[PDB]
Design a protein around this ligand. Structure first.
Ligand SMILES: *[C@@H]1O[C@H](CO)[C@@H](O)[C@H](O)[C@H]1NC(C)=O
Ligand SMILES: *[C@@H]1O[C@H](CO)[C@@H](O)[C@H](O)[C@H]1NC(C)=O
Lengths: 332, 364
């Protein structure tokens, strides 16, 4: 436990309130704008694991419900009231932006298709120009070797993905507490060999902060190349559709998925009869919009049929995996 | 707006309607089983009726109560039931509460009057009864409540005649988990629709219809019990039933499909007593103003003169028409009854009872 001072750094809420952990009060507190510039912001983004990335940083009114105001190189000056009455909020990467049947170009720029032996197998989401979030059950033995996998981005049709024109995968990381029987902690990370070039067709999606204040039945979206029938062929074109969150206690009741949903899971879809919500495939994105930013909520894990009553979709809960991802991105 | 005929004669020695005696009956029904009675060919006194029953309020819609006194009607229709104390506001015209949605809907297009009254509490005995035949067919028996509790429905559901709420024993026995209760359905009915599914490593996970219950159903389009509001003149179609409580687990063909009493949902009750009296509601419907032989005795009748040698319209002892009148001596009136008929031409003469004079009747 060689902890020089204590803990690390995070962002809070849908406005990216910069918060730090104090070893003396044992709690999280925001940072005052007083004596803050851009060079200090790059020290915070590198700390979480974003490396050379940096986007913006300003001061706003605090809404994190905090009272007391203000690791390595810890400028610890605690107080109780900020001067100029401003807390600093910074963004480390430009994400959560998109355009404004079939999906249009630029509508879901973070979606990718992952191939093995020149055929689509799973899907994933882009967070940084080198990192991709997918599902752990896509990479069981023998598909743990990173050489099997290639990625395609910015392309909507399968017939347009030609052998040898996909980005090579450098390494894959499953979650250390995965279990194939129960599908608990079904999440995995993939790292590319050369970074992508962002544009109007390829952009990343923001990871979720704490204190999102999501509604009981929040409106969300899914996308992918999945079939309309559970045994059908992969779709040639990319599709998307709307879904609603379903509270865990309801999803865990006797008449749905009796005692099968864990704290690392989340349900979304419809409990009624004939609504086609099978557009996505394994590891695909589940996103929602709030404060004009798109956030990654889950990766598709398992289900039971297509457009069947009582049987929604189950996803990996990204919010509870944010720390593990920040640690893997930091250990370059 | 139909005018009274120029000459008019009522039928003597008709019996009294005795409307107060029916409204004051001590076996008072609840709104779930509201009762109806039709009055015609009798005499009634509105001022005396409004007093013999202890009236708190009396008002009419599309009609003025002053227009009732002294008039005749073709028939008068009355519906009645007791009022749960907490639901009295449901009876306002146009309200969408529980009483008019699932028990008794007040017709607003006809000429009607609403009457609120009460009875002494110690004499009243409430009669609660379920009118739904499909509820009774599958195990609903009676209520067990206090002598002043008044049942009312909250939701009503309807089904075809082929309905049965139990699962098939052939299906249920092959379920590996989440097995539904099963029994045999009557001949002519169809079995509850069920399905066997798989998820993760589980197989034969059975799922049936109307889950959790028909009021909160996740998938109403595939549940046989359908929500429905009561129309004018109808009663509630029936309480919804929890199909997961119909039949028995591992039940075979020596058990007939019946539902337990806690399976019938969507109803409640409340007392009608306040200040030692139980409150009651009644609805009047007035059919055929200025016609028929259901007449009021509230005003003295005018002895209109039988106009002779003129083309006149008449309403004589319930029969209407148009013709000319000519008085004749008794030798030429060939009958003893108050109306004189042709073999098929109907009225050809009549005898006035208030003056014993006799007349012939010709066409205009
Ligand atoms: C009887 O019920 C079935 C479904 O249970 C429905 O399709 C049918 O329309 C009903 N009968 C009639 C005459 O509508
Ligand atoms: C009917 O009411 C009148 C008052 O308008 C009253 O004088 C009369 O006695 C009553 N007749 C009967 C039979 O109740």
């Amino acid at each position: 436990g060689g902890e020089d001072e204590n803990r690390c750094v995070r962002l809070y809420g849908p406005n990216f309130i910069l918060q730090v952990y104090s070893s003396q009060r044992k709690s999280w507190h925001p940072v005052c704008q007083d004596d803050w510039n851009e060079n200090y912001g790059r020290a915070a983004c590198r700390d979480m694991g974003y490396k050379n990335n940096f986007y913006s940083s300003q001061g706003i009114v605090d809404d994190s419900g905090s009272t007391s105001f203000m690791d390595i190189y810890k400028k610890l000056y605690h107080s109780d009231a900020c001067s100029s009455k401003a807390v600093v909020s910074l963004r480390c990467i430009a994400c959560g932006v998109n355009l404004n049947e079939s999906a249009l170009p630029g509508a879901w720029p973070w979606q990718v298709s992952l191939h093995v032996q020149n055929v689509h197998v799973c899907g994933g989401s882009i967070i940084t120009p080198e990192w991709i979030v997918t599902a752990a059950h896509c990479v069981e033995k023998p598909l743990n070797n990173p050489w099997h996998w290639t990625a395609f981005a910015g392309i909507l049709r399968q017939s347009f993905m030609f052998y040898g024109a996909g980005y090579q995968v450098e390494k894959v990381i499953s979650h250390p507490n995965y279990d194939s029987k129960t599908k608990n902690n079904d999440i995995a990370l993939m790292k590319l060999q050369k970074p992508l070039t962002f544009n109007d067709l390829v952009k990343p999606v923001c990871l979720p902060n704490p204190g999102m204040m999501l509604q009981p039945e929040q409106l969300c979206w899914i996308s992918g190349w999945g079939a309309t029938e559970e045994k059908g062929k992969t779709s040639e074109v990319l599709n998307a559709a709307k879904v609603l969150l379903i509270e865990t206690q309801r999803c865990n009741s006797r008449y749905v998925y009796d005692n099968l949903i864990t704290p690392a899971m989340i349900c979304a879809g419809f409990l009624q009869g004939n609504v086609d919500s099978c557009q996505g495939d394994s590891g695909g994105p589940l996103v929602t919009s709030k404060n004009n930013i798109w956030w990654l909520i889950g990766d598709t894990s398992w289900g039971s049929g297509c457009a069947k009553a009582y049987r929604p979709g189950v996803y990996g809960n990204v919010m509870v995996f944010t720390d593990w991802i920040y640690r893997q991105m930091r250990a370059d | 707006v139909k005018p009274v005929a120029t000459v008019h004669r009522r039928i003597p020695d008709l019996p009294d309607c005795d409307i107060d005696k029916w409204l004051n009956n001590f076996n008072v029904p609840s709104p779930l089983n509201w009762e109806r009675k039709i009055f015609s060919n009798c005499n009634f006194n509105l001022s005396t009726l409004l007093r013999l029953v202890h009236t708190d309020s009396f008002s009419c819609n599309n009609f003025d109560e002053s227009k009732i006194y002294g008039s005749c009607f073709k028939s008068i229709v009355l519906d009645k039931f007791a009022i749960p104390n907490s639901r009295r506001s449901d009876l306002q015209l146009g309200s969408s509460g529980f009483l008019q949605s699932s028990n008794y809907k007040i017709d607003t297009t006809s000429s009607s009057c609403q009457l609120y009254y009460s009875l002494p509490a110690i004499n009243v005995t409430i009669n609660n009864y379920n009118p739904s035949s499909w509820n009774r067919r599958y195990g609903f028996n009676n209520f067990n409540l206090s002598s002043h509790s008044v049942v009312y429905s909250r939701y009503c559901f309807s089904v075809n005649n082929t309905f049965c709420p139990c699962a098939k024993p052939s299906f249920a026995s092959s379920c590996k988990s989440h097995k539904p209760p099963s029994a045999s359905c009557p001949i002519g009915t169809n079995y509850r629709s069920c399905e066997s599914t798989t998820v993760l490593d589980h197989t034969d996970w059975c799922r049936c219809s109307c889950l959790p219950d028909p009021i909160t159903a996740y998938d109403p389009r595939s549940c046989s019990q359908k929500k429905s509001l009561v129309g004018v003149g109808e009663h509630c179609a029936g309480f919804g039933v929890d199909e997961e409580k119909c039949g028995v687990l591992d039940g075979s063909y020596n058990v007939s499909c019946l539902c337990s009493t806690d399976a019938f949902l969507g109803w409640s009750y409340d007392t009608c007593v306040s200040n030692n009296r139980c409150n009651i509601f009644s609805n009047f419907i007035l059919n055929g103003i200025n016609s028929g032989t259901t007449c009021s005795n509230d005003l003295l009748q005018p002895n209109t003169e039988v106009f002779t040698d003129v083309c006149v319209d008449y309403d004589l002892y319930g029969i209407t028409g148009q013709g000319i009148f000519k008085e004749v001596s008794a030798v030429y009136y060939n009958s003893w009854q108050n109306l004189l008929y042709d073999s098929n031409g109907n009225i050809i003469g009549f005898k006035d009872f208030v003056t014993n004079k006799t007349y012939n009747i010709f066409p205009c």
